[PDB]
Each structure stands twice: as C-alpha cells, then as structure tokens.
Design a protein around this ligand. Structure first.
Ligand SMILES: Nc1ncnc2c1ncn2[C@@H]1O[C@H](COP(=O)(O)OP(=O)(O)OP(=O)(O)O)[C@@H](O)[C@H]1O
Ligand SMILES: Nc1ncnc2c1ncn2[C@@H]1O[C@H](COP(=O)(O)OP(=O)(O)OP(=O)(O)O)[C@@H](O)[C@H]1O
Ligand SMILES: Nc1ncnc2c1ncn2[C@@H]1O[C@H](COP(=O)(O)OP(=O)(O)OP(=O)(O)O)[C@@H](O)[C@H]1O
Lengths: 403, 372, 375, 396, 399
C-alpha cells in the first residue's frame, strides 16, 4: 500500500491536523510535546483494517489497535468545575492500494460508543481477504506478491514449527505481531537458527545420499539464497561504517548468533555495542519479514517488496559519523518501501532534501500544522540546520557567553 | 420535564388504571399490596428512553428497567385452580419535554417476546442524544439547561454496617445521569465527589495563606459547597439540630456533622433517621449542582426535573414526619415530586389536591382519586 | 436464658443507665437519637460470650460484636470547642442461665487497649462449651435443650432486587450460625427449606410408586412433615389474618421458587409480593427455622416450646397502621416461651399492650439516662 | 464393526503373529512382557480410520493414533552387540463393517517415512463419513444404527442433553479411543440426570392437569435411567443384594443402593475398587444410550461394536474377579469384548475357545494358541498349573 | 525410627481401633470397604512431626498432612433430621525414635478447632531439629546416619542443581516430598541422568590433567559407588523373574534411561511392561533416597539404612509367578527397613508367616479389630490361603 495524506480531528493532542507524506522518505520533527508519537499511532491505527483481513491476525487480539476512549480530547478550563470530552474522534487516510486503486477511508469514535468504520474501511478489509484467498490456492499458477506493514517502536529493545518454503502458512506468518509495540527479536533468532541448522543438516543428508538429489538440491539452493538476501541487507548498514558483517550462526559459540570483523574475528552479537545491536535488530526485522512474505523472489525479496515502515527514534544509540549514513543505507537496502521516521539529530536532517521534512507545531487551542522548512538542508553543515530548522544556537549559553 | 398523565393496561395488579399528576407534589396513599411501587416502576420504565439517549446508560445492569414476563398480570381461575396470563402489558405517558413541546409515548410487551416501543418513544432518545451533543460543544454562546431525573426506592436505605482517585468521567456534567433510575444506592459516588471538593478548597486556602502570588475556581467551589450544605440543612437542622456536613481530616478523613449541645461527630455514627434523611437529600443536591454548573449558587433552587420517592417516611419519628413534605418543597422549589406513603402523619397539613387514594375492584380495575 | 437487668457506664450517649426487662416482652419507645439501638447493641455484646463458647463463632466477621474505641462516650466542651473521651466503658448484665442458676457478668474497655471481661463471662463461655460437648455425644439417655439466641437489626431488610448444602448445615448447632451478627440470614433458610420440601416430595413419589419400603422410612417422612407444618403455622400466625396470604412452600412449577397463596389472588412467588409481606415473612421464618433446628425432639411444638431471647430493632418497618396493631400479639402467639426485646417509635404498636411492658427512654443535659415505665 | 483376524510382522516385539478372535469374548492370557498391550495397540491402530471422519474426532491428532518409529522391531545379534533397526512395520486387519459386508485393510510404515495407509482404509474413512452424513438428517423412516468403539487402558482410572440431535448422537464418540472412567465424573453426571428427572416428577405431582406440557426430553431421561440401572443391576445384584442405584436428597444428598433386607446404603462406603467397576459399566451403558436413541432403553442391550479392556481385573478382590466377565456378557450381549488378564480366577469362568495364550520364540515367531486342558469350572490351582505353568506351591 | 503400635479414635471410618506392627514386614488385608488406606493415612499423619523439624514442612502447605475436619467421624441416623460429628479425633502412636528410647505421642482434633499436639510430639520435632543441627556441622569426627521415611501411594504412576557428595544440602533433599501422594519419578530420572553424565564427563576430564588424580580419583569413585548400590537393589527384584538388569543412561537412545536383557538387548525403560516400570519406580524411589541420606556408607547405603516404608497395593501389575518373589526381594534389598504394605493376593500371603498378617474387620457401630489368621500360611498352596484367610472358594459359582 501507500499513504499520501492524513487528517486528524479531536485525536489525542491535536484538535485538527493535516499532514502529507513523501513517496519514499519523510522525517517528522517536533521541538516539544508528543506530536510525533501521536502521528505515528494514528497512521498505525489507519492500517489495521487491512491486517484484519487476514485470519493470521487472529493470533493478535490487542486492545490497542482500535481507537480508545482515552484517545479522545479532554478540555480542562481553569474557571469551570466540569470537564467535557470533544466528540467525535476521526482519522481520515488517503492512499493507494492495488497499485492503481486510489482510496480515502475513515475511522471515527463517538464518546463511549464502540468505534465505527465507514464503507471504504470495510472495502480495505475485503481487499485484504482477496489476497488471502488468492494466496491459499493450490492450483494457482500465477504468483502473488504480498505487501509489507511493520511498526518499530521505542520499546523494541526492552523485552529482549519453522517453515520457509511456500505454503498456506509461512507467508501469512509474516504478518504476525507486525503492528505491536513489543520486541520481536526472539522469533527472528529462533527462525534464523532453525534455518541455519536445518540447511546444514539438509546438506549433510545431501552429501550422505547423493542418489536422492532429485529435489534436495533446489531446497538447499533456496535455503542458501534466503540467507544471502538477509546478510546483504544487514551488511549494507553495518559494514561500511563499523566493519562488522556477515551475521552468522555458530553452534560452537554455545548455540548463539555471531558476527565477524576483519581484525577482531568472530564475536557473538550479544556482546557488541548498543548501536550495532539496534541496527541489526531493525534491519533483520524488515528483512526476514520481506523474505517470508515473497519466497518466489528468494534473492531480491528485500529489493522489490513494497509497503510501509514506521520508525520512532531511527538514529538511537548511533554516533554522529553513523548518523550521516543511516537514511541512505535504509534507502539502498529497501529501494521500493515507504519509510516514515522520527528523529532529533541535526546530522540526520542534513542528508535529506527539505521536501522530506515535516515540522510539527501546535496552537494554544490545539490546532496543528505540519510545515516544510523554508531554508535548505541537503548537503549542509550540521550547525546550519541546527539553527535554521530547529532554532538552537551552536555556541552554548555558558557564563562567558553574555559578553 | 413534566409528566401529566399515566395509563396502565394489564400491568402487575391493575387491569386498567388512569392517574393524573400534580405539577409540584403528588402523594400516593394506600395499604400494603395496593400498587404504590407498581406506579413508580411504570413511571421509571416510561422515563428510561430519555436516559437511554445518553452514554451513561451503557453501564446499567438493572434488569427491572425493562418490562419483563413477570410484569404481565395473572388471573386466578378459582374453579380450575389455575393461573392464566393476560396480554399485552402497556404503559402510556403524556407530558411535556421542553418548553412548549407536548408529547404522548407508549411502551408495550406481549407474551414472551421482547418489549416494544412506539414511534414517539424514539424521539425521546433522539432528544437525549441532541442534548448530549450540545453539551460537548466547544465555544458555544447559548447555554444548555439539563433536567433532573432520579428514582429513590427502598434500595437507597443505609442499614447497620452497610459502609457502602475519581475517574475522568466523574468530572462531566452528564455524570449527573449515572445510575439515576436504577434500583441501587448512590452514596459512595457523592462521598467521593464531596471529599474531592473539600480537599481542593482546602488546598486553595493553604496556598492563599502561605504565599500570596485561580481566584474564580475558589469562588465556584465555595458556592457549590454552600448550595449542598443549605439543601441538607433545610431538612435536618430544625428538627434534629445537626446542620453542617463537612469533610474532616482530624476524624480520620470522614464526613462529620455538628450539633450545638453535642459536638462534632461522624455521619456513620449518627442515628438511622439522620443517616437516611441526609443521604436522601444529598442524592438530589449533588446532582443538581453537577448538572447545571452555570447557576453556581441556585443550582438546587432553580433546577427542574422529576424525583420519585418510595416510602418517604422510613426511619423518621412522627414529629419529623409532619415536616418532610414542606422541607422538600423548600429545598427544591422547581422540581416535580412523586412520593408514596402509608403513614397519616405525613399528610397532616397537605392540600387535598395533592393526594391520590388507590383502590381496585374484584376484577382488578383500579382508581386513584382525590380524598373527599 | 433469661436476662433481667442491664447497666451501662460511659457507653455512647449514656453517661450511666439502668434498665429492667420484662419476662416476656419489653418495648423501648423514644424518638430518633435517644439510644434504642445502643441498648440492643449492649445486649448483643453481653450475650456474645456464650456464643463464643461454640464452633459456629469461628466464622464471625462482624467487627461490631466487640467494644470499640468509637463506643467510648465523647463529651463536648463548648468553651474550648473540644471533644474529650471518657473512660472506661462498662456493660453489666444480670440474669439466669439455666434453671436455678443466677449470675452477673461484666464487660469493660479502657482507652485504646483491647476490651476485657471478668470471670463469670469466661464461665458463660465454659457453659456453652459443655453444652456443645453434651450435644456431640453418642448413645446418651439425658436430653439436651438448647436456648434460642437471635438478633434482628435493620440489616435484615429485604429491599428491591436484593436477592449443595454443606455437611455442617445438618447439625443442631448450626442454629447458632450468624445468630448475633448484623447480617441477613434469608438464604440459609431458603436453602434448608428447599431441601426439606424436596426430600418430602421424594418420599411421596416413592410411596406412590412402590408401596414396599414404608417401615422405619415412614418415621423420617413423619418428622419432615411435622417440621414443615410447624414452620408454616408459625408464619401463618402473622400474615393470614390481615393480608390473607398463607402456606409458604417450595414449587417446582414456578421455576423452583418459594411461593405463597391467596384465596382471591392466586399462587405467587414470595419475591413478587409487597415490601411488608416479604419483610414480615423473612422476620418470622428467621425465628421459626432456628426453633426447629435447635430442638429436633419436640417435632411440632419446636416453635411453641423453645426458650431464648430475641432482639428486634424497629419491629414495624414496612407495615401499615392496621398491621401495626397486631404484630406484638402475633409474635406472642407464635412463640409463647421466648423473651422479646423490641424497639419502636410508632404509637400504633402500643395500642393494646400493658403499661408494665413499656420503657420510655429519657436523658438529661449531662447524659444521665432513665428508662421508666409510663404513668 | 467386527474383527475376525489380525496379522502382524516386524511389530514391537513380534516378528510375525496371526491371531483369530472370538465372536463375543476373547481373553489374552500371558505373563508380563508377552505382547498383550502390543495386540491391543495394534487393534486400536487398525480401527482408527473409521473414527477420523466424524467431525469431532477429526480434531484430535494423537501420536499414538498413528504408527511411530518406536513401534519398529529391533533385533539383537549378541556378536556385534548392537541393535538392528528392522523395517517395515506392518498391520493387516480383517473384519466386517456392516451386515454381510466383509473387508480387509492394511497399514504400513518404513523407517522415518510417515506411515501411508491404503485406499482400502480410505474406504472405511468414507464409510464413516457416509454414516455421519446419514445420521445428520432430520427426516427419514429408516433408523440409523451406529457402532460403539471404545478403548479402556491401564490409564483409564485417572484425570447436559439427551436430544435426538446430530450433536448428542455424535457425543458418543468423545475420546472414545482414549476414554477414561473414574468415580467422580460418574457421580457428577448421574446426579445431574437424577435432579433433572425429579424436577419433572415433582412438577407432575403439583399440577396433574399439565401432563402433556413436556415429554420429549423427559422420556429420554427416564429410559436412560432405566438402561443404566439395568446394567448396574447385571453387575452387582447377584454377588450382593444391592440394586437400583439412585440419587436421594433425603439420605444426605447422596447416591444410594437398595437391599431387600438391609434397606438403603450409600455408595461412598464401598471399597475403591468396586466403585470403579460400577463407574466403568455405567459409562459403557451411557455411551450406548447416547449413541442410539431410537431404542431408548435397550440401547445397551442392542448396540454393536468393539470394546478393548487392558487388565479387566485391576483393583478387584478375588471374589469379584469371578463374575466380571459374565456380568459384562449379560449387560451387553451384542458387543465384541477383547480383554487382557493374568489372573487365574478370571479364566476359571470362561470357555477355552475364548482364551488365547501368547508365545514368542528366540526370534519373534509369535504364537497365539488355545489351552490344551480345560478352564470352565476348574479350580484356581489347576488353571494356574496347566495354563500358566506356575506351581501353586511357593518356592520357600 | 520404628512404630510398634497404633490406636485410633473417631477417625475416618473407625470408631476405635488398636493395631500392632511386626518388626520387619506386616501385611494388611481387608475384604470389604475401606480401612487399609485409613490405617496407612493415620500412620503417615503420625510421622509428620519428624519431617516438620527439617524446614521441609507445611511451608509448602500440603494440607493433607494434618488432621482435617472431613477426617472426623459423621453419624447419619435415619430417624433423625440432624447429623452430628464425633469428637475428638485422636491418633496415638507408640514407637522408638532411636535404639534405647521408647515413646508414645498423640495428635488430636476437636470439631472445627485447629489440631492440637501433646508434649511428646513437640519432643519428636525437637529430636528432628537435633539431627538437623548435628548434620549441618561438619566440624566433627564421628558420623550420624539419618533415618528414612517414605510413602508410596496408589497414584505413584499417573503422570510419570544436582549435588551428590556430602554438604549442608544433598542430605536434607532426601526428605523432600517424602510423604506426598504424587509421583516422584521425574526428579529421580533427572538426578540419575545428571549423575551419569557427570561421571562420564569427569572420567573423560581425568584423561586431560591426571595431576589431580588424587582428588579426581576419590571423587569419581563416589559417583561409581552410589550407582553400583542403586543398580544392585534394582537387580534384586527385576532379574531372577524377568532377566532385565543394569538400569543405565545412554545419550545414544535420545537421552533416556535404558535396561538390558541377555537376549533382547538394550531397550528404553519407557517401552517395557507395566510391572517392570512399577517395580523400577518403587525400588529406585527407595534406593536413591537411601543413598542421598547416608553418603558416608558409600557402598551399602541401601543395606544399612533404617526407617519406615508404606506401600499401598505392592503387587500391582505383577503376574502370579512374580507375586511369590516380591516380598523376599524387598527384604533382601533393604534388610534394615520396616515395611507396611497392603495386598489382596493369595500368592503374596503364602510367602509370609501368620505373624506378619493383619486382617481388618469392622463392626456395625464402627468398632474395628485387626486380628491374626488362625491357620497357617507359610509355604502353603494358594487355594488353602484363599479359603482360609479370605473366605473365597476356589471353585467358581458357574451355572
Ligand atoms: N404478575 C402479577 N399478577 C398479578 N398480581 C401481581 C403480579 N405481580 C405482583 N402482583 C401483586 O401486585 C401487588 C402489587 O403491590 P405493590 O408492592 O406494587 O404495592 P404496595 O404494597 O402498595 O407497595 P410497597 O409496599 O412496595 O411500597 C403485589 O403485592 C402482588 O400481590
Ligand atoms: N461516641 C459517642 N459519644 C457520644 N455520643 C455518641 C457517640 N456515638 C454516638 N453518639 C450519639 O448517640 C446517639 C445514639 O442514638 P441511637 O442510634 O443509639 O438511637 P436511636 O436513634 O433511638 O436508634 P435507631 O434509630 O437506630 O433505632 C447517636 O445518634 C449519636 O448521636
Ligand atoms: N521396539 C521394540 N523392539 C523390540 N522389543 C520391544 C520393542 N518395544 C517393546 N518391546 C518389548 O516388548 C515387550 C512389551 O510387552 P507388552 O507391552 O505387550 O506388555 P505386557 O506385559 O504383555 O502387557 P500389559 O501392559 O497388559 O501388562 C517387552 O519385552 C518390551 O521389551
């Protein structure tokens, strides 16, 4: 899918808001308040009707992907004892799906009544069901490429029957917990370790009985090509800056995943710096979902998949020299995916053009605005974008500054 | 939101009944088993649609707020020693909703099918929804006035050892319709709200004493407390001497009252009559204050609506019974009261145009007539 | 287990009070705030040790069954606008426990220390324990008679929409289950009475189908029948004459409910009847089924011959003035051997009672109380 | 469903075995480690496919309901001192699925290759499908009779409607091949049944004029109680004087039995062994009643099927071991019982044709033969010595 | 410890009962109703005060180990509407806590009040505390052997940091769940597998640096002695009848325990007969507790330990040829243990003398008796015992 515009009425901290998104990358910036998380949560709420069109979502019954009563706006008046609600709360999303079907759907809630969806939201659910039914077919010969929907929150580090080849399952399992706020690192490492050990054992039984190479040669090829695809994506981000590359599984290291550096050798990933582990988590989260969704590519599943990814605090635990490389690395690893990210770093903001930047501001009554920066930011020194866009002086207000 | 006339057909003990109500006070007088609770149940069933037009009604668990199969009249065939169920049960109400808006609505049930309402009954829900919509509007010029709606049955009583932070919905005007027609006790709701009032007021006092450096919120809180306290005084002070209900931290964070000869004592340690009368009056008063903030000091004296009281004279001694009706008329001069009793002392100095004596026939045809 | 005299010192509103009780019925008459509930609470506290001498008392959760710091009288000093607490609070009771056994016992509390009792209270507990031991004996020749002990406060009321057997519920001593607590005891009676009726109907069905085993099985049927009719007559002594309703019974046709009948009206469940009828029926049944359970060997004079003390607060709730003129005599007729102590403020309840049964409660400006017979 | 012959080869401990069963009752007799649970598990696997398509048993997928790699026989050489994993595992079953409809099916497994059944077993599966669809109808003059499949193992001893619907009818196949029968569940559901029946009896006492109000769900209850009482009477009424197990509110809210001289006695004062036997018989009768409503009280006396019992004499006094087999025969005269035992008091009351002595040579050439002596009416010592070759004199 | 007599008053199904126990083996027989489980439960309740003085007690809150209200007698009379209890319920035990000192302690409960113990029960707890504190001090030259207390119920098969050498723990862990009614085979298998893997890994480590042989030779020896004793005990029961022996742990069989037969090779224990599994469970349950309680015996912990073992349905899942060998096998593997067992098998009853047999009979009012068989039972044909002690004719009542 793709989202081109969003409109909010009486949502958490916005009386009214209209925001448009860039096709490839758009960065949200907010000097103060909680506007960015509000926008991300609204977008993540607007995408749930599609995921509800898959019975795999039966595994998720979270009471957080629908509008709640506490999401409505409360107005406190200093001179009144009573405090009322603002009703209704509306989320209106304009976008494109089917690669040619433009649409505009809406969700709303009235006070304490259950939330109500309009017709086009049900149509989005139905379009989600069409893909499910067309994928479950066995006689089908035409191939189907599913879209990707992922959410990466700020709590993606706290909480820290496998099947790869095509099937009814193993393709709808790429939508499991795809919009949750918890960490999803265990279900990646288990899958990766199972894949590695099963691939090695398949090769073992292959050279043990070469006569049975009728179909045990293509299977090994697929299990190898998936690993290649994942490793290339991870390297694209880690290698050129830190030197570590080729995430691998080594039974020797107490059944634990490890990486390798040209000079420091092989070390477990669980004992590297915070930034590298965070980056690996993000890129793996995207990549293994991409591969599990489109096995029929098996070498470019990370280079031709389409969808939307939401990232809060993209450059967390990264030093400035790494903050000038994250965005382009994400673009290069996933060239046909929409990214919506939040950031604070002036280093990041100097690596994108002013058309990919939204600055959020709120009025005294709650009216919101999402504007573009007047000045230029592409290829500029950090101190220039620090004061032109964020309004922060580069020379600290030390005692001697007054003179 | 006056109600003027009521009609019943095949309801519990009445084959048919017609009753007319007085604008301010009407008293139903009859012995046990004559149908005094039946009339009040019919009235609250007729009034519930308006409340159904609100969000506070989503938490109503009272199963007696809808017509039930047990409400259909049963006839005893003595020859065959049999009971036969007559159908349908019907409740018709006539009245006025707002200024210059007269209406007639109807409720019905047949056999064991779910109950049914007519066309004009849904417009009552629509009016409730429109009022709720108007209250929730930012930057409005016109004021909205809300009518009071309350049912005080025998479930209100405070017996021995009953011992019956605020949610964000408890700060709304419409929280005045929370369990307003249910068969329940509503004392703890009031106690929490009143304690919050007193603690905020004391906070403002402490700040304006310590470091003078806002001034309208204190006035609002003070006026609210004054309204509620005067309402309770109107009933308790003259007969018993206990006047001023307050929140006290010295007494282990409790509600207390004062006496001139006796000192300051918690409300839970006072007698049955005191506790029940105070709960009864407070139940009306704090809702009056919450529903219409803009009056600010005449909230109890100027609010309109309907209050139903079953057995208004429970736990009150004969000298107290001779004052209850006038005290209620003095505290709330603009409310329509419908009350039931069987005690003659409650009627000592009441006009004959406010009394309805209830009677039936051998076939169950009822009458509700003024005394001669 | 008669009680004859009561004394109070520094107890709630009374600085000191002496009151004497009549052998059968005593009525306390006064307005609100005069101390009618205080006297009954003091009697509860004086009687609770005997019940403490039983196992059923192990499940008592009522915190008002012991003297509390809130029961100590407070004096208001108007000059200083102060409240000062008097100490100690004291309760003295005189009476007779068994035939030819007169006693005087005392309860005390000072300040905020735990309450304390004297020796005779412990002897009362010991008597209770010995009675329990005698009841739990196999192959005994002597009979044991148990006294009734019950408190019916305002917590008994049956308001709108207010409303398998354990092996201990089949004991005689289960007649002392929550007998002095501030609670409602309707469900106990309902469950046990339903069990009675179902067993009786089982026996009827069996004797209709296979008339071959009514020998030493018919005696049990006789006992059940006699118990049912005792309870039914006790309830009839109060409702039939004024209201016309009678013969409470279990009905499976009416969705397995307790039901009453009327000559002009039909047969209707008890939960659909009026307030006065429901409350009067609950009040009388509460005494009747305990009378039946405590003394199985009387078999149909259980209510007519049992002895004990019953305390009733506001005996005339929900009853109209023509019903109030009959309550006292109805209670005396149903239970001729029980000592009743009741409170009221309604004159109609005193229409035809002797003046030697009335105690008017008065106080002076300093808190010294009197409970005097009317002139 | 009836079986007439079973053949095995390369199964757990049998290199090859051929056993022919009896029409009504057959008892497998052998000492420990002689292939009795083996034969019962083989028969249990053989009859599974008929259950796989009943819309309630197509949910349960137990590893014990299909052949496993551990069932493949292992040979010992004694020279290399290693265990040879033989293959393949084979089961071939011969029986009848309906009136005069002979059949023969087979199942196999090789190494780690998942076992693959023949299409002749899918014939049985679709036969079960046809039966379930035929019963699902609500209008037909013909009456559909279902068979009872039941397996009670050595783990049998631990852990609300009789409508003629397609749900209650198919409740008879609930865990039928992994069934358990203890006393607590039995008393629970029997008490519920009796309470529901007494409600209607008392209602008819109070208001005789309303006889016709009910009677669809009531006759079901009455006749089910009659059938269960019949079966339990067949169990207990001869050895002791008890009969007519019943629920009594008067007698302490308990299940009781009646004795012409001793009166009523509660069921909870009996030994824990006889209580479980009563529970077993009652559970079989209740399943029979639920399966075939259209008999309503002879459902137990006219249902057909196969019941497998391992250690039929478990936790039974030597007095009760002499009447269990005849009681089971008298309570269900149209069922095929296959039971395992090693007691000599169990075999002292049956005829030789039912007895099956199991043997196995040094390789696995299993035999299942008949005794050369006699057992019916014989004393315990003669049965011991002749059948089991165990001297009645202890070697002190 | 030892128990010589027991007396019950107003317990579950006995108005009163007196029963004496043989020094080595005593068998309870009851033809009708309950009563054997009642006696076993009473004995198991009379021993809890000892285990209470070891910190492995009602902290875990096994409410079954104290007298409960449902354990009191309850008399139903048909001609009375009421039903009272019989109070109090008393259990009186006479025994010997150690060689030389006899004792008589009592437990009782009155109606619904909490159960009450006399002085000697507290003294028994104090003796347990004495043994605990003496065990916890290693600053001593002389050793003391702990006593064994075990209970094996009928539900012992329903749902079938390791430290061996001496320590503060590893000796008080032999009292964990020693009187519970659940199955305790999982912990045994875990401990046994840990012991075997440690033994093999450490004898492999010996090959690496034999310099520490003097310390790694004794330690390994320990793990090689315990095993031996355990195995021997098992082989005393499951070999002369079936031929299997030498219970072992082998990772090559998917890391599960296996046993060996001369002709059938090595097979996992999970796929053997029911009788073999039951017997192995019982004997292992006794043996590993014996070894964990007295390591210093170090080769005969299963041959010199003392204590009491209670077994309900000892001969369950055993064929008659094996029912003539169980009792002597138990006596041979554990020659200094007291055994109290229940059976209803004539084969078992013919292998013991009439002095070791108690027949339980109950009166109409609940009075109980535990008598001895009048006739002889030692070395007699099965039927003689069948109709002499149990009153069952050997000729079935066929048509
Ligand atoms: N379904 C029914 N059919 C016929 N009569 C009924 C039915 N349900 C109730 N009744 C009778 O109608 C009477 C109505 O009495 P109700 O309690 O309403 O009046 P009241 O006694 O004056 O009031 P209260 O004492 O509650 O203040 C009930 O007492 C009962 O006798
Ligand atoms: N600790 C105390 N010290 C002094 N006075 C007290 C204290 N506690 C309560 N009181 C006063 O004593 C009065 C006793 O009145 P009480 O409730 O006992 O009698 P009543 O009104 O006749 O009874 P009821 O209405 O409950 O039938 C209470 O109302 C209260 O005013
Ligand atoms: N895969 C196998 N290969 C070889 N022998 C096996 C295999 N599985 C089990 N066995 C042997 O088969 C025998 C199992 O006997 P079985 O399970 O039939 O018990 P049973 O004692 O005859 O019956 P019951 O359980 O009724 O007492 C044992 O000897 C066991 O060693």
């Amino acid at each position: 899918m793709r989202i081109d515009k969003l409109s909010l009425l009486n949502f958490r901290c916005f009386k009214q808001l209209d925001i448009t998104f860039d096709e490839h990358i758009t960065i949200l910036v907010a000097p103060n308040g909680a506007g960015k998380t509000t926008v991300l949560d609204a977008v993540r709420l607007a995408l749930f009707p599609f995921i509800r069109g898959f019975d795999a979502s039966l595994y998720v019954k979270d009471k957080s992907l629908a509008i709640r009563t506490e999401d409505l706006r409360l107005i406190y008046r200093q001179e009144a004892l009573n405090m009322e609600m603002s009703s209704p709360a509306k989320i209106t999303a304009t976008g494109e799906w089917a690669s040619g079907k433009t649409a505009t759907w809406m969700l709303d809630k009235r006070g304490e009544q259950p939330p109500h969806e309009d017709k086009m939201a049900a149509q989005l659910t139905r379009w989600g069901e069409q893909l499910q039914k067309r994928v479950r077919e066995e006689h089908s010969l035409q191939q189907v490429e599913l879209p990707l929907m992922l959410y990466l929150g700020t709590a993606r580090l706290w909480y820290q029957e496998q099947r790869l080849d095509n099937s009814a399952f193993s393709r709808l399992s790429g939508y499991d917990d795809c919009l949750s706020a918890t960490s999803n690192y265990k279900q990646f490492e288990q899958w990766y370790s199972w894949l590695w050990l099963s691939y090695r054992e398949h090769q073992i039984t292959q050279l043990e009985s070469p006569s049975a190479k009728l179909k045990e040669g293509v299977r090994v090829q697929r299990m190898k090509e998936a690993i290649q695809a994942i490793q290339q994506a991870i390297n694209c981000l880690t290698q050129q800056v830190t030197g570590w590359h080729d995430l691998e599984y080594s039974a020797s290291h107490n059944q634990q995943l490890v990486m390798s550096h040209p000079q420091y050798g092989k070390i477990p990933l669980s004992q590297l710096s915070d930034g590298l582990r965070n980056a690996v988590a993000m890129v793996a989260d995207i990549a293994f979902r991409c591969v599990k969704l489109n096995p029929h590519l098996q070498n470019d599943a990370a280079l031709k998949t389409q969808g939307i990814v939401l990232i809060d605090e993209v450059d967390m635990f990264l030093h400035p020299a790494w903050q000038q490389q994250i965005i382009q690395s994400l673009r290069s690893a996933f060239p046909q995916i929409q990214f919506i990210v939040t950031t604070h770093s002036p280093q990041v903001l100097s690596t994108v053009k002013r058309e990919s930047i939204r600055l959020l501001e709120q009025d005294e009554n709650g009216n919101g605005k999402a504007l573009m920066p007047l000045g230029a930011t592409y290829g500029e020194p950090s101190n220039d974008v620090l004061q032109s866009v964020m309004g922060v002086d580069p020379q600290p207000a030390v005692k001697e500054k007054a003179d």
